[PDB]
Amino acid sequence: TYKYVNLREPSMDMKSVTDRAAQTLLWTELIRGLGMTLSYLFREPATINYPFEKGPLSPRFRGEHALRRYPSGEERCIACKLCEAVCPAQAITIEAEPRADGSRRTTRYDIDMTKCIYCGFCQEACPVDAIVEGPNFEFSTETHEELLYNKEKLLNNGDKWEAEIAANIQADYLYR
Amino acid sequence: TSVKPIFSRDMNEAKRRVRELYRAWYREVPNTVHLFQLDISVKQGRDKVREMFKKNAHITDPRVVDLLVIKGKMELEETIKVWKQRTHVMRFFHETEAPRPKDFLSKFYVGHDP
Amino acid sequence: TRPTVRPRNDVAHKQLSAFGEYVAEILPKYVQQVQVSCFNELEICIHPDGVIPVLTFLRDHSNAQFKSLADLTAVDIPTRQNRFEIVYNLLSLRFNSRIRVKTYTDELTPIESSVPVYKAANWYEREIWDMFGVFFANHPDLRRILTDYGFEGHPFRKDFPLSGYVELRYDDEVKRVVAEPVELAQEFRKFDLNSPWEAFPAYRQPPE
Amino acid sequence: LTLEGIKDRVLYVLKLYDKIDPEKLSVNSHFMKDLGLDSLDQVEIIMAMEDEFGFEIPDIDAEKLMCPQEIVDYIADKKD
Amino acid sequence: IPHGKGGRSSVSGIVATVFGATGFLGRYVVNHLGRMGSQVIVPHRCEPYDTMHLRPMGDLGQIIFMDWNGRDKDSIRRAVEHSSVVINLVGREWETQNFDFEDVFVKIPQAIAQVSKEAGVEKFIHISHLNADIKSSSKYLRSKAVGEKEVRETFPEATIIKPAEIFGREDRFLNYFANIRWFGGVPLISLGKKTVKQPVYIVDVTKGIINAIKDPDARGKTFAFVGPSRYLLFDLVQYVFAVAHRIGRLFEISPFEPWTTRDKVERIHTTDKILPHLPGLEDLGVEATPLELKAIEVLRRHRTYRWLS
Amino acid sequence: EYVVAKLDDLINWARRSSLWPMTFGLACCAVEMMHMAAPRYDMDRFGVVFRASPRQSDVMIVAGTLTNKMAPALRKVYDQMPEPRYVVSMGSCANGGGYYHYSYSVVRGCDRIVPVDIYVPGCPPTAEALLYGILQLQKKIKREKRLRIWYR
Ligand SMILES: NC(=O)c1ccc[n+]([C@@H]2O[C@H](COP(=O)([O-])OP(=O)(O)OC[C@H]3O[C@@H](n4cnc5c(N)ncnc54)[C@H](OP(=O)(O)O)[C@@H]3O)[C@@H](O)[C@H]2O)c1
Ligand code: SF4
Ligand code: SF4
Ligand code: SF4
């Protein structure tokens, strides 16, 4: 359909034009709002007082990585070379080679933490359900020699909290 | 080959052209060399210009010799003005880059199979 | 078939057969092919001669308005023996339709600017000179947009290896920020996805 | 406005460049069936006789000179 | 073992170490090892933040920092244990209110000529100066020619180096002049006689090392560094006013870091050009650089535009 | 003797408690910088007043992606800043370039161009791991200007 805005004409009669000459010359407008709508300061401030208080999130949040393990640990990753092949940024790097018993596992697993674009494509391709984006924004170290991760940085970083992780998926896994 | 040429017709008006804008370069190297506050021997600036124009020498054809120009005709826009900041210019004269051997036996001790 | 498959509509496909039937009728000096995309859009294959001419007919008329120029672009195909391609794309405000105009070319053969017909091909023609290398003559201005001042390669065509030929890095040995050949920290792995068996019978290339 | 004006100015210039001509200051020098250089180089010589003495050579002139004769002469009939 | 090409993010098989390497010279060497590939372990004394302006020098995981004192015989033994070549630029100007300066050219260059010799470094290197002569001069210039004697005993293979008065970008040599806005230029000592020395440009010296850094076949065999042509005049002090057209300091200021009414005034006029028979440069070359052309750059003052020199 | 090391409980508490950050808007990451100065998580009035001119600053901040043509601009601006300067990159594109890391016209990494100090990792860092990236930089002044004058 339509509408027309800013289409109006002044009335042009001496009952009006005072009302527009009691405005220009006496400032009866322009004190209407910012004489007032500004104050209106008397509302409670809204601030999350940071070092202590913190704000909301959701169980589907994304962040620092992990590699779980079952009960008594198997290093849940089977090195099926997938979370590697859907990765848009191509951070992941994986090198398998048959472990002594003959069950296969990894050797090098490196997520670069600069390239990773935080998809949620590597949480959703792993069929054996290993690699999982943690909900901890712990980060920010002082040397780029660092953020590159090896395998045996990840596991700890994913065994430091599994009380966080293992209780999110069981909220979220019923939807997908 | 039947397609309309760009500016030139055969090789003469063409090779009148390359002679021409040479001078716009040759007459203006140095006004920049004081303008960017870059320091070099002003004769270098007249060696490179003449080092480049002698480079592509084997060109057999119109519409090539007109193509190169349309590039060359441009640059005098940027350089005679300031759209570059010192570091789009000096990149012509490569200061930092370690030399290439280009000889034989100097290769054979450094680098595989070029 | 209905539930998950996009329901078609015929009416739109009858008219854009007609209205495009006869623009091969009244400008046969130029138009060399026309067809109807199964989604109800048109593609007019036009010789490179008419570009300013044909649009100008499409520019005004009472049976075809096509005042709004939306999208100029290009595609570059090797093994087409005339490399590049243009595709103009025009919306006719009264009649609610899209009709695209395809015109081939090469690098060396110039094409003539559309700028007096529409003033919105002013930029879209400056760009293409940077990327693919097509050279538009008689253009009020021709310059360098989207690219730095150093790229002598005209990237988006199919010969530019993705990472360009010179990485950049700053060194304090003097002042400047200078340019040293490209040295990566990872190969850019090349995966290989193209699976056999030819799942599409309808598009089956000629038997040969 | 003297033929000692335009023969004095010309003949020293051609010596002054650091390149080929070694005192061929004889006024005939015919350039590359004569002494020889690259065509682009001959196109360098033209300019410094203009910033000096004042002049242009806008045109196909510089292609025909080929000798400090003609240049002197084409200057001769030009100024006076 | 060297791989690939020398651009950056390459190997080229040499480790290194560079002691000092904060002030004028050392910063300007490592910058030539943050290019051709290396492992440059640069330690440093007291300075946490003054070393940052360096870090975009090696690519990534190349240069690596430690902390050390240097009168502790361990601090030099913890790093070098893995190394190939190790050069040494250490030492400075004026006697410190803490370091008594006597053996800091004697004990320090030996303190790092401790287990380095033992632990299996090789191609160890040290610095000398063109003008240091064990005859009596000069209170600072002396104790430097002791290292040529005293220290050379250890590590029979050195290729210890002997360059001239150098002029860099941020250097303090030719910059003591033109800072001399003052009651007037007074040459040393109000005489135009023996100026000047061999003013080689800082690139060539810092391109000498890395040319000897795997030379090969220069070890034990010391070299000295030619200047340009030729000796020079008094005009050098006029040349300053010809074109010029007339780390870890403090928060507010430094109490004393002076012009030193001491060796400083007499160290600059000591001249003594010395033995030619040292190989010493083109052999290690190929480099020599002039003055007249390279002295505009480092000199820019309140006109900042006009030159016409 | 001991007065110096007690003096640096003043000057090393002054420079950390008032910062005048420049910012660079370039790319997506700029908006999750704004919301640091919007009232929810309130950047200013926690000691750090927001943008000023290039000359008056201390901590510049790099957001966004750094192409070729922007490098000649940055390195110049980083200079003019006064002494007590730092560089805190943020976002997954100042760390090695997000993606685009393989492109032709993106500088790879923005450590290459300047001596960067603190990092933060992800398309937009969540407007949180920003401030916890600064409460790193207000804790990254434990340094002392003592023990340069006063040891060597
Ligand atoms: N070959 C020549 O032409 C020439 C000319 C002049 C002087 N020199 C002498 O040859 C070497 C060149 O030095 P330079 O050009 O780089 O100037 P420099 O300013 O003396 O550089 C020396 C660096 O090492 C530091 N340093 C001073 N004493 C130290 C010590 N005992 N232990 C560890 N570090 C110490 C200095 O301060 P920090 O301790 O804070 O790091 C400085 O960072 C020096 O020994 C110099 O005295 C040579
Ligand atoms: S997690 Fe899934 S994807 Fe990542 S490695 Fe183990 S199996 Fe392959
Ligand atoms: S996190 Fe996002 S980017 Fe990093 S790997 Fe998994 S998907 Fe690829
Ligand atoms: S990564 Fe940070 S910077 Fe690169 S695009 Fe996503 S947000 Fe903008």
- Domain ranges for chain F: 1-152
Cβ neighbours of F98 in A, within 8 Å = 89, 114-115, 117
Three-state DSSP class for A117?
coil
Name the nearest CA neighbour of E30 among E89, E105, E116, E77.
E89
Q: Which residues of A are annotated as a binding site?
A: 77, 80, 83, 87, 116, 119, 122, 126
Name the nearest CA neighbour of C101 among C91, C93, C90.
C90
**Interface contact F142, partner E, CB < 8 A:** no
CA of F43 to the centre of ligand 4 (A): 21
Q: Give the ligand at the shortest distance from the Cα of A68.
A: 2
* Residue to substitute from B19, B27, B28, B47, interface D, most D β-carbons within 10 A: B19
| Cα four-point dihedral sign F106, F108, F114, F119 | positive
User: For a pocket test of ligand 2, which of A67, A94, A107 has the largest count of ligand atoms closer than 8 A to its C-beta?
Assistant: A94
Backbone angles phi, psi at A110, to 5 degrees: -135, 115
Domain A64-175 belongs in CATH node 3.30.70.3270: yes
* Ligand 4 pocket, CB under 6 A: F 27-29, 64-65, 91-93, 98, 123-124
Report cis status (omega within 30 of 0) of the bond before E90.
no
Cβ neighbours of C191 in A, within 8 Å = 85
* Host domain of residue E151: 1-309
- Write out residues 47-86 of E within 8 Å (CB-CB) of A: 60-61
| Cα four-point dihedral sign B98, B103, B108, B109 | negative
Q: Where are the beta strands (DSSP E) in E87-182?
A: 87-88, 161-162, 166-167
The dihedral region occupied by F74, where left means phi > 0, alpha psi between -120 and 50, and beta the remainder, is alpha
The dihedral region occupied by E271, where left means phi > 0, alpha psi between -120 and 50, and beta the remainder, is alpha
Residue C138 CA to residue C113 CA, distance in Å, equals 6
Report cis status (omega within 30 of 0) of the bond before F152.
no
Interface contacts C/F by beta carbons within 8 Å: 36
Of E7, E31, E35, the CB nearest to C181: E7
Of E8, E27, E32, the CB nearest to C169: E8
Cβ neighbours of E61 in A, within 8 Å = 145
Three-state DSSP class for C35?
strand
Residue A131 CA: nearest ligand 2 atom is: 1
* Ligand 1 pocket, CB under 6 A: E 20, 22-26, 44-47, 70, 89-92, 104, 108, 127, 129, 163, 166, 247-248; F 152
Q: Name the residues of D annotated as catalytic.
A: 38
Those residues with Cβ within 8 angstroms of residue A69's Cβ, 6 or more apart along the chain or in another chain: A75, A76, A155, A159
Residue E98 CA to residue E153 CA, distance in Å, equals 28
Pairwise CB contact (< 8 Å): C108 & B91: no
Domain F1-152 belongs in CATH node 3.40.50.1100: no
Q: Indicate the residue type of E235.
A: D
CA of A130 to the centre of ligand 2 (A): 6
Tokens of E106: 């004697």
Backbone angles phi, psi at C31, to 5 degrees: -55, 120
Cβ neighbours of E60 in A, within 8 Å = 144-145
Name the nearest CA neighbour of B79 among B41, B28, B42.
B28
Pairwise CB contact (< 8 Å): D63 & B27: no
User: At how many degrees (to 10) do helices D68-79 and D3-16 cross?
Assistant: 140
- CB contact burial C28-66 (16+ within 10 A = b; e otherwise): eebbeebebeeebbbbbebebebbbebbeebbeeeebbb
Stretch (H or E) spanning E19? strand E18-19
- Domain count for chain E, please give it: 1
Residue F108 CA to residue D74 CA, distance in Å, equals 60
**Interface contact F143, partner E, CB < 8 A:** yes
Q: Which residues of A are annotated as a binding site for [4Fe-4S] cluster?
A: 77, 80, 83, 87, 116, 119, 122, 126
Q: How far is E283 from chain B (nearest CA, A)?
A: 18
Name the nearest CA neighbour of F73 among F86, F82, F64.
F64
**Nearest residue by C-alpha to atom 6 in ligand 3:** A122
**Interface contact E7, partner F, CB < 8 A:** no
CA angle D44, D45, D46 (to 5 degrees): 95
Q: How far is CA C134 from CA B11, C48, C154, E243, F23, in A?
A: 22, 13, 10, 51, 40
User: At how many degrees (to 10) do helices B65-80 and B12-27 cross?
Assistant: 20
* Residue to substitute from C163, C166, C169, C175, interface E, most E β-carbons within 10 A: C169
CA of A90 to the centre of ligand 3 (A): 7
* Chain breaks in chain F following residues, C–N > 2.5 Å: none
Query: Subunits with at least 3 CB pairs below 8 A relative to chain A?
Result: C, E, F
**Interface contact B98, partner E, CB < 8 A:** yes
CA of A113 to the centre of ligand 3 (A): 9
Residue E112 CA to residue E70 CA, distance in Å, equals 8
Q: How many CB atoms lie within 10 A of CB B104?
A: 7
CB E31 within 8 A of CB C172: yes
Pairwise CB contact (< 8 Å): C185 & E60: yes
Q: What is the structure's resolution, reported in angstroms to one decimal?
A: 5.0
Q: How far is CA A165 from CA A61, A66, C119, in A?
A: 11, 9, 58
**Interface contact B26, partner D, CB < 8 A:** yes
Residue C203 CA to residue B64 CA, distance in Å, equals 40
Q: How far is C185 from chain E (nearest CA, A)?
A: 7
